[PDB]
Design a protein around this ligand. Structure first.
Ligand SMILES: Nc1ncnc2c1ncn2[C@@H]1O[C@H](COP(=O)(O)OP(=O)(O)OP(=O)(O)O)[C@@H](O)[C@H]1O
Ligand SMILES: [Mg+2]
Lengths: 96, 239, 228, 213, 238, 240, 48, 73
């Protein structure tokens, strides 16, 4: 009788999702998450959690016990940009 | 999925047929170019003569007017139309306005002619990218570049072709803020840059310089062999 | 039915022009604020290379000596719109001995953006911000690829557009001054960009009633950033 | 064979005041040695602050009036405002030059108020050159009115006379005196005198009779 | 679904779906109500904000000194028909030196919109024009549709949730011929307040009222002069 | 079916369905009938009120092509307005080139060939209209014609266009129309409308009667039935 | 309806009895089913 | 009209006006509009129904929703 459909969260959804999946992890207490929700335009709740797990994996590549801002910024390029685009990033000069 | 048209958009806002034209640029031979104090220089690689042809009809470096040069990539057919059209505009500008043609004016003509050539259906865009180098506009050295989308743009050191990402990363760690005076030093920068060729045979480099006052000076494979010798002379300090 | 500008939906609206709105989203951010003392304007550069010459990337162009501009989205379609917008202000002065008002500039611009399939091509991929001081004081306007034209008091477009709007509606009020609105604008910028804000990431442009010149800031911009 | 031009007569006078403008003309329409009518004024209220006068060939005067009144509406819905006095003189110069090789046989004078509230008089030629003046007199009796207004308004060739600006009441009797003297010696002038006064409170009209011969 | 692609293609039921879809673009725009008395014809529209601090998009626009129109639907087809509308109004002034009769101007629109509903290469005009005017025989209220039909009427409301406005007009249409402008205008804007969600009110910043009269030129009042019209009103029975 | 997209394609058995589809779009429109007596032609259109806000005489289907020619359209109303302007324009050129009124036999040929041209190309579609043509003259008498969306055009004594095309002509043919006068026809047209489904499953309606013949001296105009109201007084007595 | 079976009857409506969930993968289909198994206070049957 | 027998319907609702916008539905989807309209009024706590309440119940059957689409003034 009822057709409930699930869509992608626009921006306010994703900023709430990052605060769920990254509250229980050792991070820097001054980072912002709205900049991270920009860089995941067409993403799901599973893809957002994969960024949160991967950013801590960069902290074990180095020798740290807290996550920095550039830990998440490399994780976005590892998850999304390594598979979503390869022609638009180097040859980008049509858009700035 | 959906591309097969230059007028349709993607669901995330792209023009894939325009983006596929830049993929045809990466099948071309690399050509670099820097500007200096007075002498501008540009060089090309991958000559690869095939034992049975004349080599004066395979030239990749041409002059549009008396004080502006041209180097390109992509496919050879579409470059010949753009070169022959740009010679008309840089000559008809002189007739309508009695000045010589600036290096900035001819790049807007090439970009705008490639602009309207992308918009209408049934018009396959140019799959070439070009380097326009000229120290023409009142003693000032400049170099620009183009793009198959039709965006003219200015760099200070440039690389294109099959393997531009290595050379452009090489020049960022090499182009000093110290301006390369004693212009054979600036020519030796290009030969050091073109030393990272796809095979680096040594005798496959065709460097062409311009001292901003004379005409084009095509270098011979005896003067360029002397500059390849002094590059190995500085390499002896590694031991 | 979602691959044609000549085809409706069962519900309503294109998708074609809806897809053209999406092309703005992958641009760069730009903020303009209307104030009774004048109109300030800010933008982000996103310079890729150090060998890349910085002043060849334009985001603020001078339409006329009392009207500025800002853009995002596709660069290739932007240079077409700037061209006639300079010409239509020039044809009007030729036949009227007066300056074209800031509102009626975009009337001429929107008359050609709604001609993509309505002749006898594709729609454009660029949003524009027009600031200027005409005889009705300082003005700030906004358009889109769909030709929908409107006046805004403070507008932020491009990438980070929606995230800027929520913070920008918080601090705006009617009794602002110009020097307050400039430093209020780039507090928003360093919260929405990913690189550290310095004198090379951004550029400014203002316009005043008696100071119709100077739609640019040349290193003065270093003084504003160091006192943030 | 067919000839496309004929002369119809007429006389138009304009005086730019300090905060006003006066436009005057006769209402006699003639051709050759005949009188068509004795009631045909040359004043045309374009806006609430601008009145134009048109002399010369009457067929072009009816055409050129309706072209300007169309472009007033075309300006307004494109700009949400009305034209100024100087904007009309800039627009009219392009219209007159647009038929350079088949010209209008019309002499034009535009009088009205500027954006500062002062008088402004623009004179024209049949090809489209203009300038801002203080007083002009166009038409058939143009040569009989310019030397007298140089004496009274411009104070030319006078000695030991102060330059008081012309008041409104003094300007009314100067207009009423020049058309009496002009109707005596000119044959294309008489039968009435339509006077339009443009101030900050609207446009007034006044009609003074002349000799009917 | 294969018949649902072009204007040219008929259906096996005999209904062209592309004309049926351009009606749906009219329901996207906001509501607007027009009506008339023996002497005065007033159409009232409803503005919609884009953001919290941008200006509201205008609906009523002047055409001629005796003709003003409202709008509902695509803004691209709005100004494209307006430039055709203004050109025909000044041609009769330039040639005939008379104002146009309102009933024969709308017949030019139905001839204008008929070609892009039959020939391939141009979509139908998604537009919801309401027209008020004065010919020599009194006021008129007209509507159009993207199926190129034009309907003479004495009261009409089109746009989003405009069915509730039609129910108010049918049970008060007997009162419209006699009352004058002090209540005829606020007979009309009592019909807009049922096309609203029941928690907000019709303010001064989101409504436009245009009046053309027998002795009155068409005049657009908005955002400052609506306050002498919104005075003397009751609230909703909540 | 499938090969039924363009109007320039044939079926495997040899007919064009795009013409066939547009014919039964005329079927969904309300009934409009036509009839001619010995000295005139009388039209009649059943027309239904949309809801209530119709203003009693809008969007009529009794047009006026020439001084003596009018139409009785049914189907898509907007498509009939553009088709009526063709017949207005066609009769004007016959006046300017020959100096007299257009014969109805020649007028229906010029219109039907114009309807025929929209049934041949893939760029355009066939019309969705069918209509009537009635005229009267002193050298030709009264004529009554009939044009389908395909373009077949020839003459009748009586016809009907709409839902009840068959259900009206059953009781048209039981009239002695060869000798009646067209004042007695007007009270007989109104009962043909009111028998077959005027407001039974529909909401409301209003009758329109056009009128041309010897009493109008060749003019074509609406009836003065508003005067004395005799059509409804005589037809509503047929309840039993 | 499992906690307030009153307002449906006291207004005169009936609740729906079947709900489908559809959309892109990884969006949260299983989460909404996993979370209502927490707060159910009723018989719940997973079906393989 | 059959399935709406058991509810508080305000008497400004024409089912003919609903058949204008409802098309290509079976009998069960016509029942589904009647069920969903009762719960939309339950959202805001409305006591009776309206014509607007059915129109939102129509779009919920085929699962639609509407925004400000910035084309339509
Ligand atoms: N809206 C959300 N908020 C928080 N986390 C989410 C959200 N959506 C998905 N996730 C995370 O994504 C993971 C995978 O989601 P899940 O597998 O439930 O998606 P699904 O739609 O059920 O996938 P499928 O359609 O393949 O069954 C979950 O473990 C959850 O942590
Ligand atoms: Mg799952």
């Amino acid at each position: 009788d009822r057709k409930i459909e699930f869509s992608l969260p626009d921006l306010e959804g994703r900023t709430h999702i990052f605060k769920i999946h990254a509250r229980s992890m050792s991070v820097e207490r001054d980072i912002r998450f709205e900049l991270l929700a920009r860089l995941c335009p067409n993403s799901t709740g599973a893809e957002i959690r994969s960024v949160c797990t991967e950013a801590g994996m960069f902290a074990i590549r180095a020798r740290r016990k807290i996550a920095t801002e550039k830990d998440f910024l490399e994780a976005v390029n590892k998850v999304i940009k390594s598979y979503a685009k390869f022609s638009a990033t180097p040859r980008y000069m049509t858009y700035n | 999925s959906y591309d097969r048209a230059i007028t349709v958009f993607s669901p995330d806002g792209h023009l894939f047929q325009v983006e596929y034209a830049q993929e045809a640029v990466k099948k071309g031979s690399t050509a670099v170019g820097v500007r200096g104090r007075d002498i501008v220089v540009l060089g090309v690689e991958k000559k690869s003569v095939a034992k049975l042809q004349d080599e004066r009809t395979v030239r990749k470096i041409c002059a549009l007017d008396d004080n502006v040069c041209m180097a390109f990539a992509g496919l050879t057919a579409d470059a010949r139309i753009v070169i022959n059209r740009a010679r008309v505009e840089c000559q008809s500008h002189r007739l309508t306005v009695e000045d010589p043609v600036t290096v900035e004016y001819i790049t807007r003509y090439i970009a705008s002619l490639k602009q309207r050539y992308t918009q209408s259906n049934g018009r396959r865009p140019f799959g070439i990218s070009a380097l326009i180098v000229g120290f023409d506009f009142d003693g000032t050295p400049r170099l620009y570049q183009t793009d198959p989308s039709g965006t003219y743009h200015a760099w200070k050191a440039n690389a294109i072709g099959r393997g531009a990402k290595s050379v452009r990363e090489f020049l960022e760690k090499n182009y000093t803020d110290e301006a390369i005076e004693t212009d054979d030093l600036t020519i030796k920068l290009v030969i050091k840059a073109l030393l990272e060729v796809v095979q680096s045979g040594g005798k496959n480099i065709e460097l062409a310089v311009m001292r901003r006052d004379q005409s084009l000076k095509i270098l011979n494979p005896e003067e360029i062999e002397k500059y390849v010798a002094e590059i190995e002379k500085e390499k002896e300090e590694n031991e | 039915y979602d691959r044609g500008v000549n085809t409706f939906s069962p519900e309503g609206r294109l998708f074609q022009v809806e897809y053209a709105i999406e092309a703005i989203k992958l641009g760069s951010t730009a903020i303009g604020i209307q104030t009774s003392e004048g109109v300030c304007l800010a933008v982000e550069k996103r310079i890729t290379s150090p060998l890349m010459e910085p002043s060849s990337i334009e985001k603020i162009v001078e339409i006329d000596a009392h009207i500025g501009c800002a853009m995002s989205g596709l660069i290739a379609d932007a240079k077409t719109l700037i061209d006639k917008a300079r010409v239509e202000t020039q044809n009007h002065w030729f036949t009227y001995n007066e300056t074209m008002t800031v509102e009626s500039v975009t009337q001429a611009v929107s008359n050609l953006a709604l001609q993509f399939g309505e002749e006898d091509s594709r729609p454009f991929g660029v949003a524009l911000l027009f600031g200027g001081v005409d005889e009705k004081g300082p003005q700030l306007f906004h358009m889109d690829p769909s030709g929908t034209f409107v006046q805004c008091d403070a507008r932020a477009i491009g990438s980070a557009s929606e995230g800027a709007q929520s913070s920008l509606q918080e601090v705006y009020h009617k009794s602002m001054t110009l020097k307050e609105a400039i430093k209020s604008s780039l507090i928003i910028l360093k919260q929405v960009m990913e690189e550290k804000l310095n004198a090379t990431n951004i550029e400014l442009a203002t316009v005043q009633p008696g100071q119709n010149f100077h739609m640019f800031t040349k290193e003065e911009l270093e003084e504003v950033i160091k006192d943030i | 064979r067919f000839s496309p031009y004929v002369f119809n007569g007429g006389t138009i006078l304009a005086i730019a005041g300090e905060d006003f403008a006066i436009v005057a003309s006769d209402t006699r329409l003639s051709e050759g040695f005949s009188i068509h009518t004795r009631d045909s004024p040359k004043c045309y209220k374009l806006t609430d602050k601008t009145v134009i006068g048109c002399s010369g060939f009457h067929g072009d005067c009816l055409t050129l009036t309706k072209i300007i009144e169309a472009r007033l509406k075309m300006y307004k819905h494109s700009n949400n405002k009305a034209m100024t006095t100087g904007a009309i003189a800039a627009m009219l110069s392009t219209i007159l030059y647009s038929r350079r090789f088949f010209p209008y046989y019309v002499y034009n004078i535009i009088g009205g108020l500027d954006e500062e509230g002062k008088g402004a008089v623009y004179s024209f030629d049949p090809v489209g050159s203009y300038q801002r003046d203080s007083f002009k007199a166009g038409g058939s009796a143009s040569a009989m009115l310019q030397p007298l207004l140089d004496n009274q308004v411009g104070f030319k060739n006078m000695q030991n006379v102060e330059h008081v600006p012309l008041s409104l009441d003094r300007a009314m009797r100067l207009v009423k005196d020049v058309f009496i003297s002009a109707a005596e010696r000119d044959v294309y002038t008489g039968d009435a005198l339509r006077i339009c006064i443009v101030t900050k409170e609207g446009i007034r009209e006044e009609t003074v009779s002349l000799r009917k011969d | 679904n294969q018949y649902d692609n072009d204007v040219t293609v008929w259906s096996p039921q005999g209904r062209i779906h592309q004309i049926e879809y351009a009606m749906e673009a009219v329901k996207q725009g906001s509501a607007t109500v027009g009506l008339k008395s023996k002497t005065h014809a007033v159409l009232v529209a409803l503005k919609r904000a884009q953001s919290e601090l941008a200006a509201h998009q205008k609906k009523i626009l002047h055409v001629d000194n005796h003709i003003g129109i409202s709008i509902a639907g695509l803004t691209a087809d709005a100004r494209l028909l307006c430039n055709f509308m203004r050109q025909e109004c000044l041609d009769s002034r330039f040639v005939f030196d008379r104002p146009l009769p309102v009933s024969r101007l709308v017949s030019l629109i139905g001839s204008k919109t008929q070609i892009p509903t039959q020939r391939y290469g141009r979509r139908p005009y998604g537009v919801g024009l309401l027209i008020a005017g004065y010919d020599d025989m009194g006021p008129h209220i007209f509507q159009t549709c993207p199926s190129a039909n034009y309907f003479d009427c004495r009261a009409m409301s089109i746009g989003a949730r405009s069915q509730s406005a039609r129910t108010y007009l049918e049970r008060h249409m007997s009162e419209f011929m006699e009352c004058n402008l002090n209540e005829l205008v606020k007979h009309g804007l009592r019909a807009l307040r049922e096309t609203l969600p029941a928690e907000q009110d019709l303010t001064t910043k989101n409504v436009s009222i245009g009046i053309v009269g027998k002795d009155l030129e068409f005049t657009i009042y908005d955002d400052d002069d609506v306050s002498p019209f919104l005075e003397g009103l009751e609230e909703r029975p909540q | 079916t499938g090969y039924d997209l363009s109007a320039s394609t044939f079926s495997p058995d040899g007919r064009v369905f795009q013409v066939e589809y547009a014919m039964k779009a005329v079927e969904n429109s309300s009934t409009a009938i036509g009839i001619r007596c010995k000295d005139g032609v009388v039209f009649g259109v059943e027309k239904l009120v949309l809801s209530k806000l119709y203003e009693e005489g809008s969007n009529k289907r009794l047009f006026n092509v020439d001084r003596h020619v009018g139409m009785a359209v049914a189907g898509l109303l907007a498509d009939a307005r553009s088709l009526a302007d063709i017949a207005r324009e066609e009769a004007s050129n016959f006046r300017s080139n020959f100096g007299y009124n257009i014969p109805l036999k020649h007028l229906a040929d010029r219109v039907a060939m114009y309807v025929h041209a929209y049934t041949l190309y893939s760029a355009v579609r066939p019309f969705g209209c069918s209509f009537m043509l009635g005229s009267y003259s002193v050298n030709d008498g009264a004529q009554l014609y009939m044009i389908d969306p395909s373009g077949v055009s020839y003459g009748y004594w009586g016809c009907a266009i709409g839902k009840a095309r068959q259900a009206a002509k059953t009781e048209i043919e039981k009239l002695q129309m060869k000798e009646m006068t067209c004042r007695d026809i007007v009270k007989e047209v109104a009962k043909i409308i009111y028998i077959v489904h005027d407001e039974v499953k529909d909401k409301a309606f209003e009758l329109e009667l056009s009128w041309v013949g010897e009493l109008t001296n060749g003019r074509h105009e609406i009836v003065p039935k508003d005067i004395r109201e005799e059509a409804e007084k005589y037809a509503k007595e047929s309840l039993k | 309806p499992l906690l307030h079976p009153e307002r449906f009857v006291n207004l005169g409506i009936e609740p729906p009895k079947g709900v489908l969930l559809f959309g892109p993968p990884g969006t949260g289909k299983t989460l909404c089913a996993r979370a209502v198994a927490n707060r159910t206070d009723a018989c719940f049957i997973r079906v393989i | 009209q059959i399935h709406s027998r058991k509810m508080n319907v305000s008497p400004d609702v024409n089912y003919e006006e609903l058949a204008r916008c409802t098309d290509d539905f079976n009998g069960a989807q016509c029942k589904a509009v009647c069920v969903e309209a009762g719960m939309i009024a339950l959202r805001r706590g409305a006591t009776e129904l309206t014509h607007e309440d059915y129109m939102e119940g129509i779009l919920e059957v085929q699962a639609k929703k509407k925004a400000n689409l910035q084309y339509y003034a």
